[PDB]
Symmetry: C2
Subunit: 329 residues, 2 copies
């Protein structure tokens, strides 16, 4: 028996119940993980509220770093380097808010000795996302300039630090002075206000880039920024629309892609960049090498005992937390 | 004084007038070309009819292969390898339907000794288009499979032969049995009917590709084929929409690009791939190397004297001409 946070009915933070729960057993292709640090994120709140549906009851959470206690059937050394005793991290766990949970081995990565559990749990999802955007969707190269919207958000901060480390000049957008400082500290060469008008904003970006425009735009904002993103691109540049935080982007007339400079539009999601354990492990290894070298840093701003998951969710939804929030079981 | 075909009023083939015309003088950055073979194409008919507007009067036509008679001011050996006496070809000439015309040196290419003037004039535009689609927009590699719509059209035929030569498997669509044979003879491994339903067609393409889908779709058709093109792509594949022969493609919900497999959508045009003389010359040289080696063949089906440009336009609009049509001055 173990401590866990279980949701039997969807709703507000008040549905999170600290319970005694059977210790999980790993099924086919799964690892059993003894948690050291548990990620708290907005997606957790969407499952909790029922905005994203799933089978009830469930133990909440998908982000965890801990040690491998056991492996399920179908987990062999032929397929994974992961072994009992290894410190690992996954953003695909079932029932992460618990002392023990399970995760598919093919979506779990080793954590190097020089990366802490709290940072691993806080960084994996945002970090894999930044990895595929920067290495696969548009492979940035030294000398490029890119535009990253929402520079002070989780992915934006990692995109900015990582691209800067790869010799890329980063221009960002943020909504407040406080976020402007966070973005500058992450390596942004220029921090801009969100666009008021697409052509005015694009004109500003072109002036910053000697008339060229940016080689790529990483747009996780969507509705409010998309027109400006498209207008800011260098000839044959890539618009990576990977989120819609402000709302959905209206259908795009393909001729707009021609007028913008024969550009590329893509709407990726992480699923298509974590297709095998080999691909997952490659992205994670490069992420944790960079964190290990302090080329990427992830601030943890809130550490709660597992029992106070309710309070963590309240503080998260109230924006009382700056930086990542974790539970320690 | 020279012979030319001049349009003083827009309209049908009847506005083409065979005239005595002053010999042109090359302006800044231009070559003076003595024509050997003149391309006849549908774009000529759009300028003739006034569908595409331009200053009247004009000598019609933009495609020509011939010898360099003289160079204008601003044309130096520092900028171009082209010299007086060289056989050259351009699809950016002014007044091609004439004994002499002008063209910007930066959009003119040398023709190797082993490529005829008629083939050069017939092949350049379609060939540069195929080059940028296959080498730049999506760089095909040996082992890829691609889908090329309108397999028996000018660009489709070159796309098919060139991709096959590069070790790519090509699937095409055509509307008739006669066109199916032309496409097969150009190297198509499979020739399909145009799509009736996007998911049915995509299911057919996935069966041909072992469930994978194609690495790229080259779609110059637009309205009637776009949904099927998007549905047929391998994960992270590229949809190159480079034409709209059937009509414009309706605005595309970006989430469709995610659902299709985190694919790329691009709407290129040749302008953005011929930005400098260096880029132009590179594409043209690779095109004419391939034609020279008979890896690419371009059928010339109609040869008219310059004076019968009217008849060439009638035959072109009546589809009495299979293969390219040229004028010989």
């Amino acid at each position: 028996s173990m401590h866990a946070i279980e949701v039997t009915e969807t709703g507000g933070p008040g549905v999170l119940r600290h319970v005694d729960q059977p210790q999980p057993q790993p099924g086919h292709g799964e690892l059993l993980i003894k948690a050291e640090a548990i990620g708290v994120n907005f997606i957790d709140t969407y499952f909790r509220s029922g905005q994203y549906p799933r089978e009830l009851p469930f133990v909440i959470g998908s982000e965890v770093c801990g040690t491998v206690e056991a492996v399920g059937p179908g987990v062999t050394a032929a397929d994974t380097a992961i072994s009992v005793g290894d410190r690992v991290v996954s953003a695909s766990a079932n029932g992460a808010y618990a002392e023990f949970c399970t995760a598919p081995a093919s979506l779990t990565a080793k954590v190097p000795d020089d990366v802490t559990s709290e940072v691993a749990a806080s960084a994996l999802l945002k970090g894999l996302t930044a990895h595929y955007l920067l290495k696969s969707v548009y492979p940035v190269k030294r000398g490029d300039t890119v535009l990253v919207h929402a520079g002070a958000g989780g992915v934006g901060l990692i995109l900015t630090q990582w691209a800067t480390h790869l010799g890329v000049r980063v221009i960002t957008t943020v909504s407040t002075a406080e976020k402007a400082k966070l973005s500058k500290d992450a390596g942004a060469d220029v921090v801009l206000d969100y666009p008021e008008d697409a052509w005015q904003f694009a004109g500003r970006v072109r002036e910053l880039t000697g008339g060229t425009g940016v080689q790529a735009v990483y747009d996780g904002v969507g509705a409010t920024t998309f027109d400006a993103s498209l207008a800011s691109l260098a000839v044959r540049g890539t618009l990576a629309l990977f989120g819609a935080a402000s709302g959905p982007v209206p259908p795009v007339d393909p001729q707009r892609l021609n007028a913008a400079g024969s550009v590329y539009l893509t709407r990726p999601s992480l699923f298509h960049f974590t297709r095998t354990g080999e691909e997952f492990s490659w992205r994670a290894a490069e992420l944790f090498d960079a964190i290990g070298n302090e080329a990427i840093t992830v601030a943890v701003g809130g550490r709660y005992p597992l029992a106070d998951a309710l309070r963590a969710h309240q503080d998260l939804e109230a924006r009382k937390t700056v930086g990542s929030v974790v539970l320690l079981p």
